[PDB]
Each structure stands twice: as structure tokens, then as C-alpha cells.
């Protein structure tokens, strides 16, 4: 619902991209309630980037399901827009509160519904092998992380978890 989790920045953008052919684009996954390609003020020459803002998230997880887009014959590149203020672009998270008892299954269970999780690891003292209570998941795709970090809460193992993305 909130109009920030419905946007998309999409980068990349064919200098020849208008709003009428992103928004002919990106209106097969949803109905696009804006559409905008960003333009120099004066020249009016392309930015090379624009936004598209769905009715709905599942429209928006839709355009990003739908990924690689080649738009006007250029692989564009779609992130949504910045819930947390620019943009992290990371591929791994951070999920702290999980404990001494959550496992590996636990996480790639809850996490999996998110991405393809390429590795989780879960985090053991070093000296002693005791899990520390967090742990790091890697997904291959950076809008696993986004969909992740914009969630309210993440419980798993019946932890609330604080998840956060991973530098």
C-alpha cells in the first residue's frame, strides 16, 4: 500500500525510452499509476532512468519476477525505491535474535519464500562452536534482500528477528 513500496527506479533506461514505452512495458505486470522517465530540464535529452509506480506490491513483485526486462532493446535495471533512505544494492542479510536454536532449515525455510538462497550461515563462537544468535543469508538476487528489509517483522523459529541488509 504505501505508494514508496510500489515504486520501482528503474536504471539503464535506452536514452530512446519514453514515458509511454516504459509505461507500455511495464504495464504487462500491473496497472502503473505513474510513469516517469527522468529527463535533463533543458535538453530534455534522457537521464537514462525513470520510475514506475504499480497499484499494488504484487504487482511490483511481479515486474521484478519478470526480470531480466529488456526495454526499447536495453536491459534495464529495476530496484524499488528506498523504504530506508539512494540505494544498497546487497545480495546479503544480516538476521540477528535467532538464538541458540535455530537452524539452518529454520532460515532457508522462512528465507527461500524470499529468493534462491545461495548460502546461509549461521553464527558460532569461535573459540567454543555455541551459536552466537545471528546469522547471514546470501541470496542470488538483491530484490530478496529488498523484500526482505522493507518487512515490519520476520519471525522464524518463533523469533522475532531483526534483519537487516549486510555491507
Known amino acids: 500500500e504505501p505508494e514508496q513500496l510500489r515504486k520501482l527506479f528503474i536504471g539503464g533506461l535506452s536514452f530512446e525510452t519514453t514515458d509511454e514505452s516504459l509505461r507500455s512495458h511495464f504495464e504487462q505486470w500491473g496497472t502503473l499509476t505513474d510513469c516517469v522517465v527522468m529527463r535533463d530540464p533543458n535538453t ?23 526480470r531480466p526486462h529488456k526495454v526499447d532493446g536495453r536491459v534495464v535495471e529495476p530496484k524499488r525505491a528506498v523504504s530506508r533512505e539512494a540505494h544498497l544494492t546487497v545480495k546479503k542479510i544480516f538476521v540477528g535474535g535467532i538464538k541458540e536454536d535455530t537452524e539452518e532449515h529454520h532460515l532457508r525455510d522462512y528465507f527461500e ?47 522475532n528477528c531483526e534483519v537487516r541488509k549486510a555491507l
Open 44 to 66: 530534455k535529452r534522457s537521464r537514462g532512468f525513470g520510475f514506475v509506480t504499480y497499484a499494488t506490491v504484487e504487482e511490483v513483485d511481479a515486474a521484478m519476477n519478470a
Open 113 to 159: 519464500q524470499y529468493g534462491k538462497i545461495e548460502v546461509i550461515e549461521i553464527m558460532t563462537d569461535r573459540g567454543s562452536g555455541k551459536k552466537r544468535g545471528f546469522a547471514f543469508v546470501t541470496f542470488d538476487d538483491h530484490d530478496s534482500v529488498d523484500k526482505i528489509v522493507i518487512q515490519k517483522y520476520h519471525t522464524v523459529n518463533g523469533h
